[PDB]
Amino acid sequence: CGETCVGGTCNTPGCTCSWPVCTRNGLPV
């Protein structure tokens, strides 16, 4: 995802909050 869910959520679509960073389909992209 490249995004960070330091807040507890992800802005990027289909991106999960994989604190501290974000994730995609359970994979950090």
- Could you tell me the residue ranges of all domains in the chain? 1-29
Q: Is 4 helix (H, G, I), strand (E, B) or coil?
A: strand
| Residue 10 φ then ψ, to 5° | -120, 140
Token output for 25? 């389909």
Three-state DSSP state, 18: strand
Q: Which residue do the tokens 């389909």 mark?
A: 25
Q: C-alpha distances in angstroms, 19 versus 11, 13, 16?
A: 13, 16, 9
For residue 25, give every residue at least 6 positions away whose Cβ sits within 8 Å of its Cβ, in sequence order, or none: 14
Among 29, 23, 25, CA closest to 9: 23
**Nearest CA among 27, 25, 17, 26 for reference residue 4:** 17
Residue whose C-alpha is closest to residue 5's, from 28, 29, 25, 16: 16
Experiment type: NMR
Token digits of residue 29? 């992209």
Here the tokens at position 23 are 């994730």
